Structures are given as C-alpha cells and as structure tokens.
Structure 1
Amino acid sequence: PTIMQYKRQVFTRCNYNLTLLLSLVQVDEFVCDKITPEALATGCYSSLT
C-alpha cells in the first residue's frame, strides 16, 4: 500500500501468531506505546488492528 492509501485490517474472533509476522521480516526499528513486542505476542485482546 501507499501511505496516502494505506491498508487496514481488523482481526476479531481468531488466534494470532506474531512470530509468524516477525519471522518474515527484518525489523529495522519498533516504537511501542503501553505495550512491548514481547507482550504483543501473548496477550488477549477485544480486537487487533
């Protein structure tokens, strides 16, 4: 996607695998707020966007 027309997907009622997202990419940086990648990987949410 472009930045002016970026994509969004909202995930509900499903099980996620964050290792799968990260194992596919080379992380340059991450900027987290009130969460860490470690926690992002294991918590339960009402939704994930």
Structure 2
Amino acid sequence: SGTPPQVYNFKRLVFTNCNYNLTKLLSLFSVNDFTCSQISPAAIASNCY
C-alpha cells in the first residue's frame, strides 16, 4: 500500500522471528525480473534464516 519511493529513498522492512509466506506475498505481484547473488532463487523460500 501507498506510493512507492524512488531509488535513493527506498523504504526498509526488517524481519526477525516472524512467519513469511511468499506464496501469498508474491501472488499479488508479477515478477518481470528475478536475479540473485550467492544463493539460488529457491533457497529463500525453504532455508531458515
């Protein structure tokens, strides 16, 4: 929700000890580009961090 900011004033969300479900997060989105560095794309959705 809300107007997203520009690239030099991005808004942060920190996550520590909470349940995340990207199957209901990214279902509201459509990925145009998906790039990752040092991990696989499937590593986030399964490995506990």
Contact 1:19 1:41 in 2 (8 A): no
Cross-structure match for 2:30: 26
Letter in 1 for 2:45: A
Question: Where do 5+ consecutive residues of structure 1 fail to align?
Answer: none
In structure 2, C-alpha distance between the alignment counterparts of 1:16 and 1:37, rounded to whole Å = 16
By relative contact order (CA 8 Å, sep 6+), the higher-ranking structure is: 1
TM-score under structure 1 normalisation? 0.74
Please, what is the CA RMSD of the aligned residues? 1.2
Describe how 1:1-20 pairs up with structure 2 within 5 A: 1-20=5-24
TM-score under structure 2 normalisation? 0.74
Provide the identity percentage. 56
Q: Kindly tell me the number of residue pairs found equivalent between the two proteins.
A: 45
Question: Where do 5+ consecutive residues of structure 2 fail to align?
Answer: none
Residue 48 of structure 2 corresponds to residue 44 of structure 1: yes
Return the offset for 1:21. Answer: 1.9
